[model samples]
Target: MSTLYSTQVKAVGGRSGTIRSEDGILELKLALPKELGGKGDATNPEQLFAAGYAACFGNAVIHVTRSNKEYKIRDNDVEVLSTVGIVANGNGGFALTVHLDVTLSGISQADAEKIVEQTHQVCPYSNAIRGNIQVSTTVYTK
Candidate 1:
């Protein structure tokens, strides 16, 4: 198993915060206020989660395709659309719903779907959010 960690910076009166990890392999300066539940122009956790899931799913697809040799996918692009749904509970906590849409430009529909299915099976992010959130995946060939 591999491990990853991120450090976040927060300060008063700042419209945005910075999150960095892995020698800039992953870095994001989030907009606050509106992005968060607050009135500040900062980014919220939902956006960050979406970004992480997208990257993870994409990488998983690539790895699965290469290992299986189903197709020679030299280069491809993926777009993940995540929807965060909040459901209020009596305890004041909320439930989440996540959906992902993946688009592949260089692979056939069947191959793309297979890769996505394998990605969901292997991606850590997907596994983490599996039962907590309702996850959906769709693939398109371009």
Candidate 2:
């Protein structure tokens, strides 16, 4: 497949190690979550994944809604809460599931639903995990 962007990072010490991007812009300590039997402090893979997923999903929602002309949503008007769940996979492995709760204003329930559905079609996170993980999306109106 073609790629638009790619980069590499260095991680040492596994879950207890630190990750530093090649550009030196992102460097953070990683720790296992309490649920995983480690200290709850510091950032973990699931938290990072959730953060990225939320941002990307929000962007997709705005872009699709604007281009489709089905809804008018302002920047920062959408709140995407991505819940990343890690569970044992029956085997001796771990897997991930996600649920994204979206909140928005100035849109009807019908329109909100449309936008979310449209966004899911293009969101990278949605595509990447599609058919591989159980993902649920819920829309909230204010």
Candidate 3:
């Protein structure tokens, strides 16, 4: 880890408190999901993870396209939908899984698939959960 970038945030309480980033960029309330017997009106940890992962994956898509001068991908309609699930491990523990749905325009299915696979290799989130989590990637051409 060369540490190209670093960020810090603090959680005042667990599942139902305030989370503030060290840089003052993000300050929000953390609420438990409705499924967990809470109101779920505000953002939760999983929502934050999904948002971060999608954005980071989208950035990786750009990086992959920039690697090849001949290929051009339209960035406007491109979208990364990350679904993160928390499941019981059957041993009184919990784990997470991810599925990314990427809608890419101005590219063929073959090219889209290639770029997506390449993106997973460079995306930090994907790398961080490589063997620890189960992740699936899908591409929808527009």
For candidate 3, the TM-score is: 0.94
Off by over 4 Å in 1: 1-37
lDDT of 3 by residue, 105-141 (tens): 7778998899899899999999999998979988988
Q: Which ten-residue region of model 3 has the weakest summed lDDT?
A: 68-77
Q: Which tens-of-lDDT digit does each residue in 25-134 have in candidate 1?
A: 65556565553455655465676677778888888878887888766665456555666555676698777677787887678888888888888889999888777676
Clashes of 2: 0
lDDT of each: 0.72, 0.88, 0.88
The superposed Cα distance between candidate 2 and the true structure at residue 39, in angstroms, equals 1.6
Candidate ranking under TM-score, highest first, comes to 3, 2, 1
Candidate closest to the true structure, highest TM-score? 3
Worst 10 residues of 2 by lDDT: 64-73
Q: Report how far off residue 33 is in candidate 2 (Å).
A: 1.6
* lDDT of each residue in 3-51, candidate 2, tens digit only: 9889888998988889999999889999998877999789988898999
Q: TM-score winner between 2 and 3, please give it.
A: 3
